[PDB]
Amino acid sequence: DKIKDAKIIFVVGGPGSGKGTQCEKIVAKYGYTHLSSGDLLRAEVASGSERGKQLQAIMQKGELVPLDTVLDMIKDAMIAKADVSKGFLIDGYPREVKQGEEFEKKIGKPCLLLYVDAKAETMVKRLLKRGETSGRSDDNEETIKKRLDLYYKATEPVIAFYEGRGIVKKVDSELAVDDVFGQVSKAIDAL
Numbered sequence: 001d002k003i004k005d006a007k008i009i010f011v012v013g014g015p016g017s018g019k020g021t022q023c024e025k026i027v028a029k030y031g032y033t034h035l036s037s038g039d040l041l042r043a044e045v046a047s048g049s050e051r052g053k054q055l056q057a058i059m060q061k062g063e064l065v066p067l068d069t070v071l072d073m074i075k076d077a078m079i080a081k082a083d084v085s086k087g088f089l090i091d092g093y094p095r096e097v098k099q100g101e102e103f104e105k106k107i108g109k110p111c112l113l114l115y116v117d118a119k120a121e122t123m124v125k126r127l128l129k130r131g132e133t134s135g136r137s138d139d140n141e142e143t144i145k146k147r148l149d150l151y152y153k154a155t156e157p158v159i160a161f162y163e164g165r166g167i168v169k170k171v172d173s174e175l176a177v178d179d180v181f182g183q184v185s186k187a188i189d190a191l
């Protein structure tokens, strides 16, 4: 039960808002264990498994993969690091209110949610630029629009939920990367 007593930080924001970017800075500075739902899912794809093929199809459409699948991947990763971790940074989960609730039922309660806030047009620009070079098949304009629609519909209520909980710190991800990280640092330092 090292885990349920562990420091757990949720990182929530739209596609291309800068979640991963900020999380890499957090890792370098604070040394937290970075668990990205996207990275865990893409790792399953990379394994060549039949599960991986199914997840790949879902992610290519810009849709949410089943709750149990991603939560179980995250839980397993947390357990594998429970003895050595300085704290957990959960990046890209939860993306619906039910994902937050099941995480609290099966794992533990977050002490902080970092709301990486960016405008829709900013996210589109960022993702199209990244899509010029990235290995992501979902960085195309049509799928980008689907990802955004899902974000506002399903994931923004997550932000509202943890605002009601009282643990959200909003960071302005339209500033320069280091400037955003200053706000991130402020929030983490106050823990």
Ligand SMILES: Nc1ncnc2c1ncn2[C@@H]1O[C@H](COP(=O)(O)OP(=O)(O)OP(=O)(O)OP(=O)(O)OP(=O)(O)OC[C@H]2O[C@@H](n3cnc4c(N)ncnc43)[C@H](O)[C@@H]2O)[C@@H](O)[C@H]1O
Pocket: 013, 014, 015, 016, 017, 018, 019, 020, 021, 022, 036, 037, 038, 039, 041, 058, 059, 060, 062, 063, 064, 065, 066, 067, 070, 091, 092, 093, 094, 095, 099, 126, 127, 130, 147, 173, 174, 175, 176, 177, 180
């Ligand atoms: N919980 C879940 N449940 C069900 N399904 C799930 C799930 N999680 C994932 N899935 C499935 O997996 C798919 C992929 O999800 P996932 O990969 O987890 O989420 P994502 O939001 O699509 O991730 P991105 O990498 O696109 O965005 P990011 O916010 O991390 O931005 P980044 O820092 O890279 O930055 C983006 C660009 O902007 C640049 N940038 C960042 N910040 C700045 C800044 N301040 N100024 C200028 N440029 C910046 C960056 O250099 C970069 O080029 C989902 O669509 C879904 O299908």
Ligand SMILES: [Mg+2]
Pocket: 019, 020, 021, 036, 038
């Ligand atoms: Mg990311």
